Motif scaffolding. Structure first.
Motif, PDB file in Angstrom:
ATOM      1  N   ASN A  23     -31.721   8.080   2.312  1.00  0.00           N
ATOM      2  CA  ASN A  23     -30.862   6.973   2.715  1.00  0.00           C
ATOM      3  C   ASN A  23     -31.530   6.089   3.766  1.00  0.00           C
ATOM      4  N   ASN A  24     -31.786   4.839   3.397  1.00  0.00           N
ATOM      5  CA  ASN A  24     -32.417   3.878   4.292  1.00  0.00           C
ATOM      6  C   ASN A  24     -31.503   2.673   4.468  1.00  0.00           C
ATOM      7  N   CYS A  25     -31.040   2.443   5.697  1.00  0.00           N
ATOM      8  CA  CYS A  25     -30.215   1.267   5.981  1.00  0.00           C
ATOM      9  C   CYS A  25     -30.989   0.251   6.823  1.00  0.00           C
ATOM     10  N   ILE A  26     -30.870  -1.013   6.430  1.00  0.00           N
ATOM     11  CA  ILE A  26     -31.557  -2.125   7.076  1.00  0.00           C
ATOM     12  C   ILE A  26     -30.526  -3.196   7.429  1.00  0.00           C
ATOM     13  N   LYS A  27     -30.672  -3.813   8.602  1.00  0.00           N
ATOM     14  CA  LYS A  27     -29.762  -4.869   9.026  1.00  0.00           C
ATOM     15  C   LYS A  27     -29.872  -6.110   8.155  1.00  0.00           C
ATOM     16  N   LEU A  28     -28.719  -6.629   7.756  1.00  0.00           N
ATOM     17  CA  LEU A  28     -28.607  -7.901   7.040  1.00  0.00           C
ATOM     18  C   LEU A  28     -27.931  -8.842   8.016  1.00  0.00           C
ATOM     19  N   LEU A  29     -28.723  -9.732   8.598  1.00  0.00           N
ATOM     20  CA  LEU A  29     -28.224 -10.643   9.620  1.00  0.00           C
ATOM     21  C   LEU A  29     -27.852 -11.971   8.966  1.00  0.00           C
ATOM     22  N   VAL A  30     -26.554 -12.222   8.846  1.00  0.00           N
ATOM     23  CA  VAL A  30     -26.067 -13.457   8.251  1.00  0.00           C
ATOM     24  C   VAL A  30     -26.148 -14.537   9.312  1.00  0.00           C
ATOM     25  N   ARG A  31     -26.980 -15.545   9.072  1.00  0.00           N
ATOM     26  CA  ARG A  31     -27.332 -16.500  10.117  1.00  0.00           C
ATOM     27  C   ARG A  31     -26.980 -17.927   9.696  1.00  0.00           C
ATOM     28  N   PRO A  32     -26.005 -18.535  10.384  1.00  0.00           N
ATOM     29  CA  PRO A  32     -25.674 -19.926  10.057  1.00  0.00           C
ATOM     30  C   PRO A  32     -26.878 -20.837  10.299  1.00  0.00           C
ATOM     31  N   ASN A  33     -27.120 -21.777   9.391  1.00  0.00           N
ATOM     32  CA  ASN A  33     -28.157 -22.780   9.599  1.00  0.00           C
ATOM     33  C   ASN A  33     -27.886 -23.621  10.849  1.00  0.00           C
TER      34      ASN A  33
END
Lengths: 189, 188
Positions: A89-99
């Protein structure tokens, strides 16, 4: 041994992004890829769709995943991509970034302020970016890392013996997965 | 087991050093041995960088950090230079180190489209006029996958191979270790 710490920057309302996955072993693995909320909890309706959601990655094989959006515009939002493998199990951050956001996290790393209350060291992050701590020291003792959420705070549990301590130092992890320069401050009283 | 993305280290040419974290994913302690190599993963006579600590103990599931400090190599200021940091865990992994002049304008994704392509001698040859390594993450020619290799700055790379084929598609890997958008061109 892993070097650095990758993260995925997802531009808000982009149709999608592609992400590479690689099997490091000489045996095949069935991988299930899913996006979770900031606490790695399954959401009621997944905010993102991953394709292929489930497939067989052979020994030493590399494959691309599509991550497609299915959010505030004044700050980042955090989700997690977790890839779980079993034999077929590998979890990676998904950073939702407004333009809309100006600058990058390293430009705001210095802006963290610090208080101590209730036996915890509390960081305040006035910036619109996650300050993803990669090194944290208080009174000379290492404190386990945790992100400081944007326009918010994070309170760290302290090991014994730190009552009265003043001196905090930290490094954030930059967008490229590396450790940024060291900053040092005293706790605000 | 399953790695997501591909980290790289950007080293500003004028920097005293940079830091990167190392983590032991095993449930047993290991001794971490770290060194820097040239672009071909070979030892240099005099290491242009020094990694500290070059040997240390990382207990199970523990993380710590390495400092990579330039140590006298003379790097050009008109383009990137590539080295490798390699780390070995030993009981009681290599990553690109991209030296980047502050003089360079932009980042790799701004020049990804500018690759041009020729076929000669049974090879697909990319030309990279930009001052950045174009680190290929996905490459197809005539609809067939071609194993990735970096395209060096202000230079070329020739891939072993499709005699009739003209259509190339590619994605570079951006500074953040992620796949960039897809480009398609026909060979010249």
């Amino acid at each position: 041994v892993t070097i650095g710490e990758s993260r995925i920057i997802y531009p808000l309302d982009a149709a999608g992004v592609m992400v590479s996955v690689k099997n490091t072993q000489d045996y095949p693995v069935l991988i299930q890829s899913r996006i979770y909320d900031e606490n790695k909890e399954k959401e009621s309706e997944d905010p993102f769709v991953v394709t292929p959601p489930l497939f067989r990655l052979d020994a030493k094989q590399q494959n691309s995943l599509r991550i497609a959006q299915a959010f505030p515009r004044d700050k980042e939002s955090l989700k997690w991509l977790c890839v779980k493998g079993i034999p077929p199990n590998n979890c990676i951050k998904l950073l939702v970034r407004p333009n809309e956001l100006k600058g990058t996290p390293i430009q705001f790393a210095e802006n963290l302020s610090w208080k101590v209350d209730g036996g915890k060291l509390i960081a305040e992050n006035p910036s619109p970016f996650y300050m993803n701590i990669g090194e944290l020291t208080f009174g000379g003792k290492s404190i386990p890392s945790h992100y400081i959420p944007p326009k918010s705070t994070w309170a760290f549990d302290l090991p014994k013996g730190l009552a009265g301590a003043r001196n905090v130092s930290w490094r954030i992890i930059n967008d490229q997965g590396g450790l940024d320069r060291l900053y040092s401050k005293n706790v605000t009283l």
